[PDB]
């Protein structure tokens, strides 16, 4: 079984969506009428920008400590989503983060893919520093935040309270996280404020047979879902 | 002009076609010294949070013979105001024909509390220069009026009035 998914002009291949997690069991959804207002006015461009965007692949090695991305930050140079994210002032969007990872049967290791709401990292006081964009940042084992603390002084073993998946190479080699819009507000600035944060840390480290490929690829494919923004909506009276 | 009768009149005249706006009004009804002391702004100063729409209404007070066009542009929040007529036209705008309608109304929707420059802009540009028939004066005045809509909402009273 091999499921080929098309969004817009963009096509990806998934071995199977057999174990695809939905954070808090809540699927992405537009701003409902009970929480909307015809005078605080949204529009829905979930036509074109809401497609699969595939970041530049990262290379998992024996020495890799982890990687992280912020959202909608990572997609701030990604075509129409990045355009809308700057043209519009207020926006909301869920995501579908499909972390594929390509390894042989003679590689071994495990990744913990964690989706974090309000992933405030720390050695933080800098926008460019806290928002690396498309390439994301990396963790450490001692700026760059600490592996076992997630940066936020926080034992990684408890990280599984967050929405997550485990990519254990002997079993599954891909993970999917369906993230709804999570914020204290129904809608907010995308450029000033990242709602979600992806963090991929090797729980079990990479290892492999003698002369296998030394560094395997982890690929992220992020699809905005139910992307909606403001709000140019003017009434001209006679 | 301030604290006079002339502080209420935007004068249109005949001068080189600089696409600088006739006016560019920022939509901070609580903190903008123009909109601040309007009745709307006076009430908003009594409250901490507020949200709704503002209808602005420009009224032409020239001759019945005068003819021309103005461009009333609306820049949403987060967008810096347009500096030229083309930038204004490619955005949200109303071409107001003076000879046909003496007023132009524009309802701006995304007005909310400052804190505790954003909100947007209402700009006015010359699309055309004003055409008069004879020795009719080539110096007119447009007035402007602002109000909240029925939807508009305030809350958490903050009377701050001392000496």
């Amino acid at each position: 079984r091999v499921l080929q998914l098309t969004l817009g002009n963009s096509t990806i291949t998934t071995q199977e969506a057999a174990n695809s997690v939905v954070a808090y069991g809540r699927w992405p959804e537009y701003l409902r009428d009970s929480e909307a207002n015809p005078v605080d006015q949204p529009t829905e461009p979930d036509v074109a920008a809401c497609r699969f965007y595939t970041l530049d692949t990262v290379s998992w090695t024996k020495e890799s400590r982890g990687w992280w991305w912020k959202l909608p930050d990572a997609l701030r140079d990604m075509g129409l989503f990045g355009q809308n994210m700057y043209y519009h002032y207020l926006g909301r969007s869920g995501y579908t983060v499909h972390v594929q990872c390509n390894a042989s049967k003679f590689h071994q290791g495990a990744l913990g893919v964690f989706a974090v709401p309000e992933m405030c990292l720390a050695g933080h006081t800098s926008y460019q520093n806290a928002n690396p964009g498309e390439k994301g940042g990396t963790f450490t084992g001692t700026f760059c935040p600490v592996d076992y603390l997630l940066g936020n002084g926080t034992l990684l073993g408890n990280a599984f309270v967050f929405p997550h998946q485990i990519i254990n190479l002997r079993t599954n080699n891909c993970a999917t996280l369906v993230l709804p819009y999570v914020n204290s507000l129904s809608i907010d600035s995308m450029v000033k404020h990242n709602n979600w944060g992806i963090a991929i840390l090797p729980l079990a480290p990479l290892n492999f047979a003698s002369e296998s490929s030394p560094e395997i690829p982890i690929t992220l494919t992020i699809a905005p879902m139910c992307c909606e923004f403001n709000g140019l909506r003017n009434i001209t009276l006679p | 002009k301030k604290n006079t009768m002339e502080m209420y009149r935007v004068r249109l005249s005949d001068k080189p076609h600089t696409d600088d706006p006739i006016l560019c009004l920022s939509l901070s009804p609580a903190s903008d010294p123009r909109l601040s002391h309007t009745m709307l702004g006076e009430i908003l100063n009594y409250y901490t949070h507020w949200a709704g729409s503002l209808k602005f209404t420009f009224l032409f007070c020239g001759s019945m013979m005068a003819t021309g066009k103005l461009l009333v542009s609306y820049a949403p929040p987060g967008a810096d105001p347009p500096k030229k007529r083309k930038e204004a036209m490619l955005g949200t705008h109303v071409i107001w024909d003076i000879g046909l309608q003496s007023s132009c109304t524009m309802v701006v929707p995304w007005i909310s509390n400052t804190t505790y420059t954003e909100g947007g802009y209402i700009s006015v540009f010359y699309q055309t220069r004003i055409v008069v028939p004879l020795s009719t004066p080539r110096e007119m005045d447009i007035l402007g009026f602002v109000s909240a809509c029925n939807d508009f909402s305030v809350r958490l009273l903050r009377d701050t009035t001392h000496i």
Binding site: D40, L90, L185, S186 | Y47, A51, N113, V154
Partner: peptide
């Protein structure tokens, strides 16, 4: 800060 607010005029009574 920029929050969606429903109609509420009770405190302006």
């Amino acid at each position: 800060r920029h929050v969606v607010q429903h109609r509420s005029r009770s405190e302006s009574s």
